[PDB]
Each structure stands twice: as structure tokens, then as C-alpha cells.
Amino acid sequence: LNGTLMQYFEWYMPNDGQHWKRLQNDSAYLAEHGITAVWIPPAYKGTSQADVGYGAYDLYDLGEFHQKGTVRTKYGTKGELQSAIKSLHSRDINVYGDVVINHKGGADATEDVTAVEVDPADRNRVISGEVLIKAWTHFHFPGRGSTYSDFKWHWYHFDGTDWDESRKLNRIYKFQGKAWDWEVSNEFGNYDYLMYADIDYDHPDVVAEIKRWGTWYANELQLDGFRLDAVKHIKFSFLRDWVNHVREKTGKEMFTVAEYWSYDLGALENYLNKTNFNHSVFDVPLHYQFHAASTQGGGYDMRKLLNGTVVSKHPLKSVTFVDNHDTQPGQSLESTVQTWFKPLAYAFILTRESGYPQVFYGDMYGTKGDSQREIPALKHKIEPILKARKQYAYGAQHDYFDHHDIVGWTREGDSSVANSGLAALITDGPGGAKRMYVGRQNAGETWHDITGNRSEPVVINSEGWGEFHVNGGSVSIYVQR
Ligand SMILES: [Ca+2]
Ligand SMILES: [Ca+2]
Ligand SMILES: [Ca+2]
Ligand code: NA
């Protein structure tokens, strides 16, 4: 059975505390369409109730304690989340929790700290003498106390910050005696620092504490895996060790995928090598190819889709996706795949043999931002493709990328899955036909377009070939009638 992941959130969902209840109500629907795992947004207390979750204030407050002016997180309470997870597990759906450990935001109080300013363009370069600043670095968790963990954070557990409260100044400050971690992205010289208070992974106590929390988090929510946030800003060797640690302590597989945001395949391959391939990464390069194809009105050379992607070289270490919360309208990395091309992009990630595909909540149900270009609900267009993956995308694959517009691939089917096998065609330009091999064992079968875009069926000839058609700027996926 093919595995399919779903990112279960988008950036602009309402702050109504009903999200965990929604996820629970959706478990039957997800199982029906072949979703086998869900990645949920950060479940711990952020800087305020409305925090999407990346501010990460208290990793041990899963919407359980009265802190930051609220008990629940934006998504609901700990009990509601546990109930949703139980519902998903009852239907054999795995749950991956988001892990935000690059920084900590929303400190309870400031501390006087001696620091120096560094060059934003080259953080290895100090551009000032020592200065006494007031930094938001004291975390004592007034509403939780010592429940679950007595660890308290201070300035010396961090490498730096971007704000001096005493002068109300936004500059990148590195604390006295600290050094940016390595290895991390070399963008801007050293990209250890991103935002809020940056965790110092050179600190022994911090290393031990984040590992301990990881195990606690997995056990408390009975997680099956993780999605790692902003890894290009976190010491690579630490991430490698953290993943191994949690797997060792829980004794579970703990599938893990990391968000290393880079357009460059080279940087992604370096990260994989440095973490000894013990976890996967999102295929960011492929997302940008989809965006480019969708915005070039047919001028994109579709043959490029087979090269320069993580999945092309590391088929078992890539999580493929079309859009996500970073790329949706209104966000800093906005690069949304245009609606007309979106079904074609989904066919590419859902019916091909390599990669672990991920469906976006925003693409299924629409995004709720305030722009005039929000993503509309496309679940009606994606559901047929999810069915194709669940029931038909099995067996040997054959690729036909011999044209700048019309490209396709087939899956011969596998005898262990009744009536499996398919032929997919997509085109970013004018429609047409392509003769493709689907396996001599399918000779004589009548296949039809499960998307409903084409009404005429195709009969497989004696030598296992079929002449398949596709409409302009569209997708057709043929399966046995
Ligand atoms: Ca450090
Ligand atoms: Ca960092
Ligand atoms: Ca083209
Ligand atoms: Na650091």
C-alpha cells in the first residue's frame, strides 16, 4: 500500500481553538482517500494564543497550562489533540509532530548581557565593541512550574538575539563568550542566527535537554515521526544525533523529514551526507520547477522535471510536495503553483514510484488569507488522483519525457493489487497523444481516464502498448475500467 502524507494546516486558519477537533472529525475522510500519515502544526505554546506555532515559547506546554494569556494553543488543548491522535491511530494513520528547536521566542523576562554586533551579511564578522544589552532570554514558565521538566533557560543557553530591549534596537547580537554553531548553512557566512533567541548547540546542558524533551514529546503524544523545522540554521551533527537518540529511546522507526530551505540541490545533498542519510528532506527544488512550469504559459521545458530534484538522486530520502505554508499567498517565500497546473503537479508526485508525496491542507480546502489570490479548495480535483495512488499506482514504471510540453509515465501494475496499473499524461501546453507501454500482461484491457477529463477509453494492444490522449493544459490518468 502506497504511503501518502498530508500537511494538516495552512498559515491563515482561524484562531478558534477547534483545529484538533477538526482533525479528529476528518479521520474517516483521510483514511478513505489513502492518507497514511499526517504532519500536524507545532502543538506547544507560542508567544501568544494566535501564534501559528513557530515562536516556540514552552515545548512542554501542549495547550495545558495558563501561560501567555491562554491555556489552549491556537489549535486547541492537549486533551483534544490526544483525542484526535487516538482517532487517527484507530484508522491506521500515523502522526508526525512538528519540531521547532532552532530558537525560543517570548521570554518571560530580560537579562543584562554583554554582546557584540555582527555583520548581517557575514555573521562571522564582528562590527562593534562589547555593549551591555537587555535581552529577552529568561524563560521560567510561570504557569507550568516544574511539571514535566525543571529546566529553566537563561542567556547562556543561547548564542545571540536580534533585539536590545534597553535601546529598542534590532541588530544581530552575539553574546559574550559565544560562537555561532557549525556546521549550518554558509549563507551570510554562517546562518546559525535566524530570529528570536538562538539556541546554543555547543552547550552540553542544552544538547542533553533537547534530546530529553524529544523523547518526552514522542511519548506524551504517541507520535510516529517528526517534521524538523528550519534545519539549515541548526548544527547538522546535533540533528543527526537527536534523531538517533529519539529512535533509540522509543524503540520506534520514527520517520523524520527535515525542512532545509534551499533552491540548490548541492546544499541539500551536503545536508543529507552530513546527517548520514538518517532522515528525509522536502524536495524544495521540485516545488520551484512546478511553480516555474505553472507561470510560463507553456514555455517551460517539461523534460527538466526529471533532473535537479532531490527525488531524482535520493528516491527514498525525498518528501515531494506542491505547495506548503511557506509558499502559499502572502508568505515570505510565496511561489504558489498556479491552479490550472496544480492537478498536473499532484499527478506527478502521487502516481510516480519514487518520493514520499505530501498533500497540502491549503490545496484541499483552500487558504483563508486576505489576498485576492488565495488558493481555492481543489479537493474535488485531487481526490481522483489520490484514488489513483491508493488503488492503481503499483509496479514497474516507464517514463516518456521526449517532448517539451507533453510528458507521461506508466505503472504496469502488480499482481498483488487487483486491477492495478495506470498511464498518466500531463502537458503545460497544447494537448495531443503519446504511445506508451503499460505491460504486455495488460493486453486487451479497456482503460479510461479516472479524472474524467477525457471520455474516450483506450484499449491496450497485443504488445502492451496504448495510445493515450490528453487535453491542453491538462492531465489524464488511465486505469482499467
Ligand atoms: Ca554556539
Ligand atoms: Ca540556529
Ligand atoms: Ca512546455
Ligand atoms: Na546557535
Curated annotation (Swiss-Prot):
Effect listed in the UniProt record for changing residue 119 to X: Decrease in thermostability
- State what changing residue 186 to P does: Great increase in thermostability
Give the record's pH note: Active up to pH 11.
Record's cofactor remark: Binds 3 Ca(2+) ions per subunit. Binds 1 sodium ion per subunit.
One Pfam match: Alpha-amy_C_pro
The outcome of changing residue 144 to X is: No effect on thermostability
Protein's UniProt keywords contain Ribosomal protein? no
GO annotation, cellular component aspect: extracellular region
Residues engaged in binding Na(+): 159, 181, 192, 198
| Outcome when changing residue 267 to H/K/L/Q/R | Loss of activity
Q: What is the effect of changing residue 269 to X?
A: No effect on thermostability
Documented applications: Used in the food industry for high temperature liquefaction of starch-containing mashes and in the detergent industry to remove starch. Sold under the name Termamyl by Novozymes.
Tell me where on the tree of life, at the top rank, the source sits.
Answer: Bacteria
* Marked site positions, Transition state stabilizer: 326
Q: Which Gene Ontology molecular function entries are recorded, alphabetically? A: alpha-amylase activity; calcium ion binding
NCBIfam families in UniProt? PRK09441.1-1, PRK09441.1-2, PRK09441.1-5
Protein name from the UniProt record: Alpha-amylase
Q: Which organism does this sequence originate in?
A: Bacillus licheniformis
